[PDB]
Amino acid sequence: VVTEKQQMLEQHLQDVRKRVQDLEQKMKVVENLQDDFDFNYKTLKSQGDSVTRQKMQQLEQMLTALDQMRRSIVSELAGLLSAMEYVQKTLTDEELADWKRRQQIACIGGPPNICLDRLENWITSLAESQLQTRQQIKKLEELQQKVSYKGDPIVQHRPMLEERIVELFRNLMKSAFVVERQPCMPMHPDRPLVIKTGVQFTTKVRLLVKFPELNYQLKIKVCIDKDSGDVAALRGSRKFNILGTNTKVMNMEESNNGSLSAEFKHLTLREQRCGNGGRANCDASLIVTEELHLITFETEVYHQGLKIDLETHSLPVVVISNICQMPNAWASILWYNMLTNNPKNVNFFTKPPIGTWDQVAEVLSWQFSSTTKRGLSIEQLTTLAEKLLGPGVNYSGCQITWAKFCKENMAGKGFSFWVWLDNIIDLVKKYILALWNEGYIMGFISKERERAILSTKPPGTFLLRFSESSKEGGVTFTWVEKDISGSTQIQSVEPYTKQQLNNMSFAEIIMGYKIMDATNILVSPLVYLYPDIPKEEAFGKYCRAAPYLKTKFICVTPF
Amino acid sequence: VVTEKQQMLEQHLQDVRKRVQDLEQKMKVVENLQDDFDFNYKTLKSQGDSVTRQKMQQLEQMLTALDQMRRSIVSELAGLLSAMEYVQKTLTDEELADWKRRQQIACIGGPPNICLDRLENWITSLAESQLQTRQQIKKLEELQQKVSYKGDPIVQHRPMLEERIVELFRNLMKSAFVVERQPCMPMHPDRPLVIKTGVQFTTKVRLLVKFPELNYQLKIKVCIDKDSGDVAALRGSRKFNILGTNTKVMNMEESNNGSLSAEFKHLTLREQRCGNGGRANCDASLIVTEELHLITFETEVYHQGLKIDLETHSLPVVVISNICQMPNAWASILWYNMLTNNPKNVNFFTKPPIGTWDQVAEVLSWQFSSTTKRGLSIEQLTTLAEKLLGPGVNYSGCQITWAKFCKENMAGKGFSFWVWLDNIIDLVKKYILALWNEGYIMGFISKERERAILSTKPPGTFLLRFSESSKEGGVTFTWVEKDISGSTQIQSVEPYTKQQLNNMSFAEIIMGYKIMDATNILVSPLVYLYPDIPKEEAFGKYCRAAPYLKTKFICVTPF
DNA sequence: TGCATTTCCCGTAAATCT
DNA sequence: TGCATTTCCCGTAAATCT
DSSP states (O other): OOOHHHHHHHHHHHHHHHHHHHHHHHHHHHHHHHHHHHHHHHHHHTTOOOOOOHHHHHHHHHHHHHHHHHHHHHHHHHHHHHHHHHHHHIIIIIIIHHHHHHHHHHHTTOOOOOOOHHHHHHHHHHHHHHHHHHHHHHHHHHHHHHSOOTTOHHHHHHHHHHHHHHHHHHHHHHHTEEEEEEEEOTTOTTOTTEEETTSOEEEEEEESSOOGGGTTTOEEEEEESTTTSSSSSOOSOOOEEEESOOEEEOBOOSSGGGOEEEEEEEEEEEEOOOOOSOOOSTTTSSOGGGOOBOEEEEEEEEETTEEEEEEEEOSOBEEESSGGGHHHHHHHHHHHHHHOOOSOOTTGGGSOOOEEHHHHHHHHHHTHHHHSSOOOOHHHHHHHHHHHHOSOSOOTTOEEOHIIIIISBOTTSSSBHHHHHHHHHHHHHHTTHHHHSSSSOOBOOOHHHHHTTTTTSOTTOBOEEEOTTOSSOOEEEOBOOSTTOSSOOOBOBOOOOGGGGTTSOHHHHHTSOOOEETTTEEOOOOOSBTTTBOTTTSSTTSOOOOOOBOOOOBOOOBO | OOOHHHHHHHHHHHHHHHHHHHHHHHHHHHHHHHHHHHHHHHHHHTTOOOOOOHHHHHHHHHHHHHHHHHHHHHHHHHHHHHHHHHHHHIIIIIIIHHHHHHHHHHHTTOOOOOOOHHHHHHHHHHHHHHHHHHHHHHHHHHHHHHSOOTTOHHHHHHHHHHHHHHHHHHHHHHHTEEEEEEEEOTTOTTOTTEEETTSOEEEEEEESSOOGGGTTTOEEEEEESTTTSSSSSOOSOOOEEEESOOEEEOBOOSSGGGOEEEEEEEEEEEEOOOOOSOOOSTTTSSOGGGOOBOEEEEEEEEETTEEEEEEEEOSOBEEESSGGGHHHHHHHHHHHHHHOOOSOOTTGGGSOOOEEHHHHHHHHHHTHHHHSSOOOOHHHHHHHHHHHHOSOSOOTTOEEOHIIIIISBOTTSSSBHHHHHHHHHHHHHHTTHHHHSSSSOOBOOOHHHHHTTTTTSOTTOBOEEEOTTOSSOOEEEOBOOSTTOSSOOOBOBOOOOGGGGTTSOHHHHHTSOOOEETTTEEOOOOOSBTTTBOTTTSSTTSOOOOOOBOOOOBOOOBO
């Protein structure tokens, strides 16, 4: 929906249109007058060998009128130029920049609407206004070539009018060239900005100035690690090359608005082996999953007498060689986009900024509502804000470092926070996908707060959560049955590794698991998911000459 | 061990050595005599301006003696040449050819000893004998340049002596260039002659003439589909190129004998895309797994004034693009090597020859004693000779077509004989490897002959065999428990797909599987593997603040 | 050496050829 | 169309770099 500021921009853009139209009218009038004066001047010489000299008076009066129209025109153009100069800034440095920011957020799973139609409509409108304005200025020039005098306002102001309009257009064209769709592997739609060597990836650029005359006219060339893989920047980085179709003609294909776009599919990266530089120097100058690269797009436009060089680039990209590097790669992308709006800080991880728990907790939620049906409840969130910060109340402004989030392992484990969570999110797909679904799982709750269940709810009531001390990821639950039941001693079962969920689904385990107490007594799974919901309404849904004895496996704990 | 024929060849080779040595002696003598005659002749002219003319008599008598030695020499050389010509044939067309045949057999899992040391020793001996013989012939030539007369036996016979010796050597060099190790992917050691595009493969050539002078002198170039991927041969075939290090210098590296060899590692195939020809025409002119190619090796040798071009090639190779094509590819390799000794019949599958059950049953056994500890007992074999030929007694000379073996599916199934068996052999590795082992499994036995167990042996006695009606492969057993036991109604359980053996091993199932009869009655697995061996002696060997309830799964049939 | 990182490649699934 | 065949590429394991 349209904000107030966007209402205003739209209004200004129409005011600009109107002034251009008023000027056009004024040019038509001044030119007809100039034609009339030109004709009368000649007719008067056809006899310059009766009191027929009010014509001389007519001739002088027309001339005076022309001068006045010319001053008026030149004065209005200057005014229009200044207005354009003010508004173009609102358009490019504010609205478009807000769009660039929201693209960052959308990449990391945030609230989308990275729609370019409005911007394209604004940008195109202004561009049309500017070209028509340039043509008026050019007309003033040809009018002067036919009729001029001492003090002619066209001779004194036109050059500056040209310069200003060329500068506005030249700059609007450059801002209008953007990356509509960041480098991403079709196999990992939720993981843009992470490229694996050898695997195909696509990316798309757009030119927000919707000029049909330019259809199929521009050739866009893409490359990675342009020039900066030399001097006056980072050092020790791996360097890469793009394989596949390197260039692409921009066109208004695929219908939808008929926007000028250029899409590159089947692109591939390969490491550029050989050469030298250094490579070492303190922690090898950034681990591979913290090194950042830029994919650059370039072309040139020749239009109505002008040559304009256009260049744009993707957001920093992490390049990996194997998929096992994806989790850390993603953490770098999360962190970068979560905390900076700088679109080309390739050195970002030299000294990474610190985040607040607020910003990190939002990001973590998105990572769930991406791959799945829904995010994270505070019951899951807060009891994870603890995992990183232990005891405490209200984490609002609590700082979280890159080290704490991903670069280093958690307090007493051999793996990092993010990698552990990424493994959950993974697992909660390949298996238990459907089962995670809407709200059937607690997932993140400390044994202490986990005690506040059977300790307050009736025997049978269970709760669902993840393996908190395993790298690859696992899932479990709660129940009370053993010995003589002192005061209901809460229990859990050894985590099921990915392989363990290939045999039976988690809700198949919940709805089909007894307990072999002592001997022969094979009791049962416990009723009522946490509040008071009997297991069935929630889990009973994801369940399902001759012969040979048809079979099915079950585990069931044997003490 | 040395056959009688090999004893003889060795003997002939030594006779050849001896004659060369006797000739050398004879050359030494004739040359000293020629020196003496030459000297005396001059001494006699130093006075040809006392009865000092018995010297003239001495001079003539020396000359006569020289002529006689020369006739004798020329006569013995001709004789040696003929002997060499006879023996070289025994060496190249018989012993070496037998070695080429045994290489075929070894490739398809047969009885090895494809050892080249003997051949190399024979070949090298003959080569040395021939070069020394060539040098004598050359010496006769220089002797003639100094002393000649009318009827000189050197002038009349030498040219033919040269021609014959050059021909023998030139041909021995060519036969001596062989493929010691056929194209094979290191990842599939039991599958030589089957190459997958993109995957590395190695191959090695040897030059059986062990001349140290040639160390590091020859450059061997390898290629695939040489010239024949043009005219006067097959048509519609895919064409390929070799990627990686295309050439390799031959040397006496890796110690062992110091044989001249050249090994190519990290070779890769890629389809040569584009062009034309036809491609279609009747069944697309051979399915991809029946198309055959040749990897050719070439080099040239310049030695002691001779230029000799050497060329050799691998056995026909099948080129696949995906591993799922391996089973059919292998069947083509089996069939080819089982039934022909032609080393370059690329059209073989145009009209494939027919095999006898004997030859096929041997081959099938090897395929087991390759990947595993041991082959196939007739109890398994014969009851598989039936699967292909049904009812019958003594299959000795029963014909088996390519269609029946692999090209077409079995009678009432959607898959072929060989592909089914290859899947067993596979399965009997990834899982049940250890378990297949020596003699614990029947594996192949028709329900009819399978009845001759509990129908003669006491309740409990079980038998082990494979899923006869599943493409991917499976395993099962026998036992009697259900209803009220009419007369012990033999039973089996639904086959366990590859995934089903990832949870519990087959012998873990045998030693840990009860039967849930009616309700709560969970009986047990049956004792005594087929004869009278209690399950345990055979299968019991492959079996094996806090906390969390440690777990293990079991299936057990629930009627 | 052990670590960080890349390469190798099967096997499943999707794409392409015919 | 459905079939034959190749390409894509994850993920496990081995190789290489440092």
